[PDB]
Coordinates of C-alpha atoms and ligand atoms in Angstrom, one line a residue:
X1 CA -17.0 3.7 -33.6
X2 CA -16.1 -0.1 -33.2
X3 CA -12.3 -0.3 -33.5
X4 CA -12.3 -2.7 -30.3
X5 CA -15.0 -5.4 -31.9
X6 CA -14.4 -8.3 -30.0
X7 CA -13.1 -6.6 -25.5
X8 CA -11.9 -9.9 -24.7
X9 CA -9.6 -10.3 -27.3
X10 CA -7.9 -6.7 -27.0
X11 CA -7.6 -7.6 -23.0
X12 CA -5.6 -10.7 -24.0
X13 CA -3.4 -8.5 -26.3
X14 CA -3.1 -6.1 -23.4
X15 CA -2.1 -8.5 -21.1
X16 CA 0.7 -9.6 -23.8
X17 CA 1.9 -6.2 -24.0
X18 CA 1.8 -6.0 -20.3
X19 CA 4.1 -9.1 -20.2
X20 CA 6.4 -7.9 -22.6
X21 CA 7.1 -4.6 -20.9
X22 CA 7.3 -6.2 -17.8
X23 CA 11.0 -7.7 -19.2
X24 CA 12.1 -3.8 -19.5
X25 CA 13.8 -3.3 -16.2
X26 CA 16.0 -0.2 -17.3
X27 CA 15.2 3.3 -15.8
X28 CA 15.6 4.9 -12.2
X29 CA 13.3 5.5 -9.4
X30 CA 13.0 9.7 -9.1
X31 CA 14.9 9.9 -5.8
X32 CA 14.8 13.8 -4.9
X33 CA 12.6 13.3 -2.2
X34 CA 11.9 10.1 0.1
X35 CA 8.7 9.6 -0.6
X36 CA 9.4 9.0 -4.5
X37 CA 12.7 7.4 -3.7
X38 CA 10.6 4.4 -1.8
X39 CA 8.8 3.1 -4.8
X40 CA 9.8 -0.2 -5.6
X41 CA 11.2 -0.3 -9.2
X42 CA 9.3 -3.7 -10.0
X43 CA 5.4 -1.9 -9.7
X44 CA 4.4 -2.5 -12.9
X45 CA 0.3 -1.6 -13.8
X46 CA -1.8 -0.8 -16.7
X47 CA -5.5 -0.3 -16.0
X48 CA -7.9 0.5 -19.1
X49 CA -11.2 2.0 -19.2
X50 CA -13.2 2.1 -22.7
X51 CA -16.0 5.0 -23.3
X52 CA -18.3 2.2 -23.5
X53 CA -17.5 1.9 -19.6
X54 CA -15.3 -2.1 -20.0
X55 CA -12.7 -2.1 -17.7
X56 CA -9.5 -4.5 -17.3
X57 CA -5.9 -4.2 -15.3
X58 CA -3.5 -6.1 -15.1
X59 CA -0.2 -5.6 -12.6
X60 CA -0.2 -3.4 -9.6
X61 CA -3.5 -1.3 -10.3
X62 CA -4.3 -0.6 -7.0
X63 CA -1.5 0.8 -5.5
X64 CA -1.8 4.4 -4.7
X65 CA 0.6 7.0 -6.2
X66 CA 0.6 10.7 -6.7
X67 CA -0.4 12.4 -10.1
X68 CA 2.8 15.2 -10.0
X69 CA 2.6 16.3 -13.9
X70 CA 0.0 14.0 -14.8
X71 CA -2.5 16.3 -12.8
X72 CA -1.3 19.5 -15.1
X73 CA -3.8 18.5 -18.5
X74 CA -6.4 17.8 -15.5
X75 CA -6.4 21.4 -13.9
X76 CA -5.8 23.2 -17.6
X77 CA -9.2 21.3 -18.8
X78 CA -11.2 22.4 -15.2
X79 CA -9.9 26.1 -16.1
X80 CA -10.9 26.2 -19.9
X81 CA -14.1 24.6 -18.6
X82 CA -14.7 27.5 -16.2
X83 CA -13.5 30.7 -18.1
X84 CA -12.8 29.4 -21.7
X85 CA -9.7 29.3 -24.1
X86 CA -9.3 32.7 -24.6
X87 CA -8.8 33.8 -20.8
X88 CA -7.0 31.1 -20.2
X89 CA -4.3 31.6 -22.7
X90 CA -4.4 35.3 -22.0
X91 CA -1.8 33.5 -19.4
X92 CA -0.3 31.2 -20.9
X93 CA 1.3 29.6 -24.6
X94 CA -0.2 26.9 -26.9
X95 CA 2.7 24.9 -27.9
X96 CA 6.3 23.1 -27.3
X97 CA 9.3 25.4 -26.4
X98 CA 12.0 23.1 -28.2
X99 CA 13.7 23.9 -22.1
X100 CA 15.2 26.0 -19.3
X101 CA 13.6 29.5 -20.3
X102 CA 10.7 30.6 -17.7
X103 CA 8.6 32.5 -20.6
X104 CA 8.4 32.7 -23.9
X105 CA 9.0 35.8 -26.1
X106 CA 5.4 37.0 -25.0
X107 CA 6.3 36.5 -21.4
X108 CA 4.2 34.0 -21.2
X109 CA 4.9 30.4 -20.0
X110 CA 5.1 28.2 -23.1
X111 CA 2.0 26.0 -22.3
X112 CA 0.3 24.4 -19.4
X113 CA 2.3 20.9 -19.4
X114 CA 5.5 22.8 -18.0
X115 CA 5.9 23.9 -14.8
X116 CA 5.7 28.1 -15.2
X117 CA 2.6 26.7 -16.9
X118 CA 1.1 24.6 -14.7
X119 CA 2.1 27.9 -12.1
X120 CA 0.2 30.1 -13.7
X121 CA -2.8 27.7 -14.5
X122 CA -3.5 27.1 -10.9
X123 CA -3.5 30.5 -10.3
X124 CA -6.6 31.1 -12.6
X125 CA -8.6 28.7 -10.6
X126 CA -11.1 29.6 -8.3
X127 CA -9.9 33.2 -8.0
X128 CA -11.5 34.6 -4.6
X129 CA -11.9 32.4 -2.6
X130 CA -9.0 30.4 -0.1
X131 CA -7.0 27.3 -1.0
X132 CA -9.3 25.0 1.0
X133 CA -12.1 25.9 -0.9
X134 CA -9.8 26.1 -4.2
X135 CA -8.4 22.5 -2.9
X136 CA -12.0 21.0 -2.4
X137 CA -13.0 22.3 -5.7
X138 CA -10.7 20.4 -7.5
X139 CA -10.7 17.6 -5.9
X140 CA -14.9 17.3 -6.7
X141 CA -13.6 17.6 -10.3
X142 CA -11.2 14.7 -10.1
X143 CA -14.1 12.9 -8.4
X144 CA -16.4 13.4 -11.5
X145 CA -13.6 12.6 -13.8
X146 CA -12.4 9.6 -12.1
X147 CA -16.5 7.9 -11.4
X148 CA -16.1 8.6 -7.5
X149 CA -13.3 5.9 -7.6
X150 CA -10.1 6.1 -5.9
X151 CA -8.9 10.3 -5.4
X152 CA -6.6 10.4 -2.2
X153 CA -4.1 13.1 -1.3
X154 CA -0.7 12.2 -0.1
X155 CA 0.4 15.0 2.8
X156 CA 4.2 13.5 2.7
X157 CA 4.6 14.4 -0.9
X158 CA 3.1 17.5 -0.1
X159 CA 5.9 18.9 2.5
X160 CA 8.4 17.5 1.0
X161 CA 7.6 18.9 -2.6
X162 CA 7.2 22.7 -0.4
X163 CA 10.2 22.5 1.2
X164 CA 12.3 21.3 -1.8
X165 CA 10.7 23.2 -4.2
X166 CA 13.5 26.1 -4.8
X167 CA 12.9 26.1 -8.5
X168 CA 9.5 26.4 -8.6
X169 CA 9.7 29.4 -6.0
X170 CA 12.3 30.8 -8.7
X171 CA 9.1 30.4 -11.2
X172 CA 7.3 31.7 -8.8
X173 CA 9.1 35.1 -8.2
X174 CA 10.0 35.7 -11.4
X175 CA 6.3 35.1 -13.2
X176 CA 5.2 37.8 -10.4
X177 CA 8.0 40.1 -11.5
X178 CA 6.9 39.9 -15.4
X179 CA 3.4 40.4 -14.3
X180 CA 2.3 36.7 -15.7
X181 CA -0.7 36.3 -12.9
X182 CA -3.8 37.7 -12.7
X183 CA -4.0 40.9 -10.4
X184 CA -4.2 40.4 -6.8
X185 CA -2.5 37.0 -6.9
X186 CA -0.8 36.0 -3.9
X187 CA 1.9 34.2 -5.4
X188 CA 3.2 32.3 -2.3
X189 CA -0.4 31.1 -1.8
X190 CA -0.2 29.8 -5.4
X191 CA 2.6 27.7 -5.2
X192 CA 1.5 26.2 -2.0
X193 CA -2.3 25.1 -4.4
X194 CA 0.4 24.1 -7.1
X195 CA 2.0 21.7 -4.7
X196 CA -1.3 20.2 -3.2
X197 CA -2.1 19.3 -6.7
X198 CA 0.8 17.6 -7.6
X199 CA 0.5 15.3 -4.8
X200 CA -2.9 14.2 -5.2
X201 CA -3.6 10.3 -5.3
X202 CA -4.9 7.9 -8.0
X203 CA -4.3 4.2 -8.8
X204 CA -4.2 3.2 -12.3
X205 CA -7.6 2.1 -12.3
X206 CA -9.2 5.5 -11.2
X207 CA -6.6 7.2 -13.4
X208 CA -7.7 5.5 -16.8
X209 CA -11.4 6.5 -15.5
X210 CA -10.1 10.3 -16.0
X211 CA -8.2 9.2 -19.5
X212 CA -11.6 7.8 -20.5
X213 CA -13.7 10.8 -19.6
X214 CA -11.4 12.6 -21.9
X215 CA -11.3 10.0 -24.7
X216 CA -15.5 10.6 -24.4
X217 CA -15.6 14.0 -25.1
X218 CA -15.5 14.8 -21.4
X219 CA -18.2 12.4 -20.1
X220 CA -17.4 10.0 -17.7
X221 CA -17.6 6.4 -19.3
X222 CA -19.1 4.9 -16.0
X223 CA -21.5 7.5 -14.7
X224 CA -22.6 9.0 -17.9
X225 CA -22.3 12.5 -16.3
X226 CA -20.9 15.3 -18.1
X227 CA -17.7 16.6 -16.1
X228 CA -16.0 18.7 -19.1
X229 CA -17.0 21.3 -22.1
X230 CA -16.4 20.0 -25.5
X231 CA -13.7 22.7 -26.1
X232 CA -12.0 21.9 -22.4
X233 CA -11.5 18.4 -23.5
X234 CA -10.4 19.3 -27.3
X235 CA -7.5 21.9 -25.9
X236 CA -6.4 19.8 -23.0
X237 CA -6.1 16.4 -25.9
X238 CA -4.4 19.2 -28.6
X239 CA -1.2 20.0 -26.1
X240 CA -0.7 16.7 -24.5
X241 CA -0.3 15.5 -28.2
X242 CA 2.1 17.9 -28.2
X243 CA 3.4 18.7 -25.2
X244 CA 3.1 15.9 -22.6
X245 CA 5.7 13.4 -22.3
X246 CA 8.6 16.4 -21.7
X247 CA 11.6 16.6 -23.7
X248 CA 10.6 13.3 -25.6
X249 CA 6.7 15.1 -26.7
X250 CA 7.7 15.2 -30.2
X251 CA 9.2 11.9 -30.8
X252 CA 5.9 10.1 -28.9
X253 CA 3.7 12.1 -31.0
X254 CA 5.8 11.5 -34.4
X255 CA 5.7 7.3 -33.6
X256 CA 2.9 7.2 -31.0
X257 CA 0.7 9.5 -32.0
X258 CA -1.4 9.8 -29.0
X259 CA -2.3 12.6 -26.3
X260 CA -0.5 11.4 -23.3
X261 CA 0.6 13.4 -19.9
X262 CA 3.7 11.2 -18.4
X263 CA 4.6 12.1 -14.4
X264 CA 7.7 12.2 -12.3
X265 CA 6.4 8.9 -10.5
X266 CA 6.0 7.1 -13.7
X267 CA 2.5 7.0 -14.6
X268 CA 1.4 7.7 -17.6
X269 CA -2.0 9.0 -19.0
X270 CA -2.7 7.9 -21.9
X271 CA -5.5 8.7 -24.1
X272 CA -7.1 7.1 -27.3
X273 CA -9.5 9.6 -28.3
X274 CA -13.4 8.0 -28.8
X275 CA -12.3 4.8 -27.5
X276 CA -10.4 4.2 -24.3
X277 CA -8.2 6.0 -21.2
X278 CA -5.4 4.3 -20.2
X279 CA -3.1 4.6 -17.0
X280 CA 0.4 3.0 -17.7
X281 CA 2.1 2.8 -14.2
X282 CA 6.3 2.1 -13.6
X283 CA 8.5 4.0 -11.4
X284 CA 11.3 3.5 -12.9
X285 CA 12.1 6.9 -15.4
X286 CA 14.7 7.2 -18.2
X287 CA 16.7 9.8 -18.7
X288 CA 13.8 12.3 -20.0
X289 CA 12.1 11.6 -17.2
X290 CA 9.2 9.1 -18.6
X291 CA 8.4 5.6 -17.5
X292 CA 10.5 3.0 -19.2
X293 CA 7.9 0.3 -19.1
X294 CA 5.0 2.7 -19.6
X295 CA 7.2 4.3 -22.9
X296 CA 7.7 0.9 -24.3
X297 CA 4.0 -0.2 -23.5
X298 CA 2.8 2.8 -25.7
X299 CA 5.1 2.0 -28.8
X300 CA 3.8 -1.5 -28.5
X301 CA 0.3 -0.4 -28.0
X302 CA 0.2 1.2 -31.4
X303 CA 2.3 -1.1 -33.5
X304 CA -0.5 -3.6 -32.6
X305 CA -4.0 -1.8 -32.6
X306 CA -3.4 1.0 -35.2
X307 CA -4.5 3.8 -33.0
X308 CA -1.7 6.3 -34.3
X309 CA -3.9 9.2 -34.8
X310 CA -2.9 9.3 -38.8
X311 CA -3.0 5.6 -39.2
Ligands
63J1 O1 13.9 35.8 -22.5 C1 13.1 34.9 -22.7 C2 12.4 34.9 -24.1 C3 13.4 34.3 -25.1 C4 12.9 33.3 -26.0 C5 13.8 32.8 -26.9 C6 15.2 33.2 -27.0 C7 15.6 34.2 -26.1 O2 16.9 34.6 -26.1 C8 17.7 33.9 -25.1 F1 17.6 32.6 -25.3 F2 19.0 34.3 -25.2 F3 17.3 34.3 -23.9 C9 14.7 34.7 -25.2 N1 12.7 33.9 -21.8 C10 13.3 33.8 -20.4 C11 14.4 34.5 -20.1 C12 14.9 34.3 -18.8 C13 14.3 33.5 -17.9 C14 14.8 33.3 -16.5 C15 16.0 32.5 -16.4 C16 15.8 31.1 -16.9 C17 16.7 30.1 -16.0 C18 18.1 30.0 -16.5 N2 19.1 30.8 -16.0 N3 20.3 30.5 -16.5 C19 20.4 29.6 -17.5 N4 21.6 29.2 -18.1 C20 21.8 28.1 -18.9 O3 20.9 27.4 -19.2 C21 23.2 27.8 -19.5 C22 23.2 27.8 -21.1 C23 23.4 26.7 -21.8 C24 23.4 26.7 -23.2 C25 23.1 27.9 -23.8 C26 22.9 29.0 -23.1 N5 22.9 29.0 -21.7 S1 18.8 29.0 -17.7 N6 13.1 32.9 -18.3 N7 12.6 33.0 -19.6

């Protein structure tokens, strides 16, 4: 599958894009807690990995950042891996909500890329054993999906995200009260994993390492090691097209056309599926809550390469 025939000239065009979105300097920092609100609105990174294993960045590539919602696709795909899609979504929906409602009309949350989601998802990891072990197991994963490159953990985020977290402990209690986790579920317990994973560490270059074990059919491009099943990577791609850039997931798949997961500190994973992962990096968020640079980047991205996934 050559639709990148000559790397070297898709870099350039990259790098043109890059330049181009650099101009976009719309968009606000998030700001609800400090250690979002210090990001400099003028970090600007795109980092691309092929399945081949070719790399190139451009911008700020190397500066660390947490995942927040861009680690929800990850820790859906390690949970279909371990107990399959029909456990799984036992717990949870398949597919947009059209959202302030905690459940859908199955009392279930709507799908793993929104919060009550990504609640319940964390909760079927691991069951059994305690959150350092449930931690460490993840973070292994990450390891294997990102090539053993660059998976920190940022303890700031972490407290901060706990102790301002009053909506996700409303999830919390009220998933519990409609019975949405499996039994014997300490739900407190839960929400403290959830927020551990949220402010786990990447740079855009071990980022579009993950993107690129997901674009190769869950085989990491630069270790050749098999990190995913088939049918983990296949779900996790199906309802990020759908689902994964919040309130705007059905405009970006209508003119993008691309799985992508977009994150509160403006990356974005971004996925061409049996030929590249990208990470798209920008603080700065519009008003639905996606990277302004990284949202024009993608529209660019496809208007240029045909990767629209009905183009
Ligand atoms: O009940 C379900 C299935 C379901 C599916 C579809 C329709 C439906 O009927 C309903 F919309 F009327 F509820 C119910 N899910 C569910 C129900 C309750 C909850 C916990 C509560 C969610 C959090 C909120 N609490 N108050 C709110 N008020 C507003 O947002 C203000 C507003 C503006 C505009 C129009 C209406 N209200 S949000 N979480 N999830």
């Amino acid at each position: 599958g050559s639709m990148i025939p000559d790397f070297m000239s898709f870099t350039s065009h990259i790098d043109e894009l890059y330049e181009s979105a650099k101009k976009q300097s719309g968009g606000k920092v998030a700001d609800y807690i400090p250690q979002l609100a210090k990001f400099s609105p003028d970090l600007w990174g795109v980092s691309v990995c092929t399945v081949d294993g070719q790399r190139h960045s451009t911008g700020d590539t190397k500066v660390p950042f947490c995942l927040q919602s861009c680690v929800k696709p990850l820790k859906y795909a390690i949970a279909v891996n371990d107990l399959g899609t029909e456990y799984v979504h036992r717990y949870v929906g398949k597919e947009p909500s059209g959202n302030k409602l905690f459940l859908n009309e199955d009392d279930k949350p709507h799908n793993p890329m929104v919060n009550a989601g990504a609640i319940v998802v964390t909760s079927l990891i691991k069951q059994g054993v305690n959150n350092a072990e449930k931690f460490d197991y993840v973070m292994q994963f990450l390891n294997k999906m990102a090539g053993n490159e660059y998976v920190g953990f940022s303890n700031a985020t972490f407290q901060s995200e706990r102790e301002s977290g009053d909506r996700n402990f409303a999830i919390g209690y009220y998933l519990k009260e409609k019975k949405c986790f499996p039994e014997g579920t300490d739900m407190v317990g839960i929400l403290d994993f959830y927020f551990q994973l949220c402010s786990i560490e990447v740079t855009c270059e071990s980022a579009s390492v993950m993107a690129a074990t997901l674009a190769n059919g869950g085989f990491c491009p630069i270790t050749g090691e098999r990190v995913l099943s088939p049918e983990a990577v296949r779900n996790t791609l199906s309802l990020m097209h759908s689902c994964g850039m919040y309130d705007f997931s059905g405009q970006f798949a209508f003119h993008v056309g691309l799985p992508a997961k977009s994150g509160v500190a403006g990356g974005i994973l971004l996925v061409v599926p049996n030929v590249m992962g990208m990470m798209c990096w920008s603080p700065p968020l519009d008003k639905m809550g996606n990277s302004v640079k990284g949202i024009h980047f993608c529209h660019d991205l496809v208007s240029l390469c045909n990767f629209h996934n009905y183009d």
